[PDB]
């Protein structure tokens, strides 16, 4: 293992070959999950891009966080998307937290602590256990077929995800930076492979 | 009974079948009342919707809180409405408190603690005792005949109503979240039935 505390991944150039692949000890299919992270880039105002690609052999888009220019954040699961609009975008590092549950189909999204209205999406579904998780490039196949126009340029870090919805109390604690015990992906005990031009550097954001 | 403290009702999908029905031990016709609540949705900028439907057999609109796009808040009593404008609408949870009195006909409305100018409406009237109270769907009949275009999507909670006007002191205390003793509807000792897809979840707002 490794500890990335106060460190982050940097993609400086637009390409279709640089990417970071993560590994998880997950064995059981998921019925509910949450994922939090922090990222910083300026392509927001030029073109869309992916943020966190969780793909399975049966689905290139099992879970996907995307940004669409003039649209906002697109949270997709099981090949279906939900949109959260953003009339205008600021230029600064942003921390987000998204959660989904199969039992009811409720979706929660949080940006900078402020929650967004809940929504319903793909009730009763299940998520495959074995999967490939990638940062930097969108997936249209099982770990391949990347698109340059869907790549990400900038910094990313503080990648974590549990396998059960968190109460608002807990989300606020995560933003404040208190202690926590991630279950599926631990930024403090993480495993990763890298390809292409990707660097590890001290984080910009506090 | 039940205690909903730190919990709220969620309607995730637009429909004409989901709704929550409340019950009150009220026996005497009302000569004055107040009602406060907290709610969160984003349909504000798309179409109007109801918030709290209190209907009687003789009147589908005995008491009604409505939002009209580009107009604002519409407080209706005895089938007649009064308007409070809002040039622009923010996107965040909102807490409101409205009061009416039959003796004089004065109306008070409070949003986020800031009071609005008083107005006169239906002086000398009385309100029927037996009634049906609904959250989620507007009423055009005694507990039926809902309209999809008048439904509500989002979260609602902290539903309470006395049967006498409250002094500004008291309204400020209610917003600060201090202790209080509701008379007609107690969020802490509430009774409710549910229909359709409605969920109970921890509240978003502080």
């Amino acid at each position: 293992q490794t500890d990335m505390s106060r460190k982050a991944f940097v993609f400086p150039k637009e390409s279709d070959t640089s990417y970071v692949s993560l590994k998880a000890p997950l064995t059981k299919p998921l019925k509910a999950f949450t994922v939090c992270l922090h990222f910083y880039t300026e392509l927001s105002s030029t073109r869309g891009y992916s943020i966190f690609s969780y793909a399975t052999k049966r689905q290139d888009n099992e879970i996907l966080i995307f940004w669409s220019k003039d649209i906002g954040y697109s949270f997709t699961v099981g090949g279906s998307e939900i949109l959260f609009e953003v009339p205008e975008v600021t230029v600064a590092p942003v921390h987000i937290c998204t959660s989904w549950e199969s039992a009811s189909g409720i979706v929660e999204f949080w940006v900078d602590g402020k929650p967004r209205v809940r929504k319903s999406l793909k009730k009763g579904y299940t998520v495959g256990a074995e999967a490939s998780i990638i940062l930097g490039q969108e997936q249209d196949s099982f770990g391949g077929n990347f698109e340059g126009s869907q790549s990400l340029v900038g910094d990313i870090g503080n990648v974590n995800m549990w396998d059960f919805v968190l109460s608002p109390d807990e989300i606020n604690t995560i933003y404040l930076g208190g202690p926590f015990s991630p279950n599926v992906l631990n930024w403090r005990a993480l495993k990763y492979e890298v390809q292409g031009e990707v660097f590890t550097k001290p984080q910009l954001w506090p | 009974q039940t205690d909903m403290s730190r919990k709220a009702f969620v309607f995730p999908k637009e429909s004409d079948t989901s709704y929550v029905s409340l019950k009150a031990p009220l026996t005497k016709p009302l000569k004055a009342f107040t009602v406060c609540l907290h709610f969160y949705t984003e349909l504000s900028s798309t179409r109007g919707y109801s918030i709290f439907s209190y209907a009687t057999k003789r009147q589908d609109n005995e008491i009604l809180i409505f939002w009209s796009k580009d107009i604002g808040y519409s407080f209706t009593v005895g089938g007649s409405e009064i308007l409070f404008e809002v040039p622009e609408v923010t996107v965040a949870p909102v807490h409101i408190c409205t009061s009416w009195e039959s003796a004089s006909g004065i109306v008070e409305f409070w949003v986020d603690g800031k009071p609005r100018v008083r107005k006169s409406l239906k002086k000398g009237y009385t309100v029927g005792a037996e009634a049906s109270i609904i959250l989620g769907q507007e009423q055009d009949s005694f507990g039926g005949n809902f309209e999809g275009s008048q439904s509500l999507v989002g979260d609602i909670g902290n539903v309470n109503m006395w049967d006498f006007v409250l002094s500004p002191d008291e309204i400020n205390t209610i917003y600060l979240g201090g202790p209080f003793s509701p008379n007609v509807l107690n969020w802490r000792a509430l009774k409710y039935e549910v229909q359709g897809e409605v969920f109970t979840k921890p509240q978003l707002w502080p």
Partner: nanobody
Amino acid sequence: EVQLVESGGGLVQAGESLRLSCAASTSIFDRLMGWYRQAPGKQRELAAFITPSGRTTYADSVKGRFTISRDNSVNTVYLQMDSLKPEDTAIYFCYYRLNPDQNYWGQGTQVTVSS
């Protein structure tokens, strides 16, 4: 599957306007709609689309000329083009948003704007 069905196209001269439309067999309360046109020889180019919230986006060329509208009540979207000109003539395709990789397409309708 979404049974998209568009209509409102044919033969028109330059300097006119047309209000085409399309409808779907499912609620459009959340998905966004758009339009693609394809000129003879080139690919499918975006023209305009409208989000579920109501925000609208228009292609640069047709900026200030076209206009899109939506109606949840009947599950139908509309596009009105004004001051039609011959170069805008092309095959117009319907759009149904889906996962970012994928998207539904309609049969498309030819609109030939002569002089």
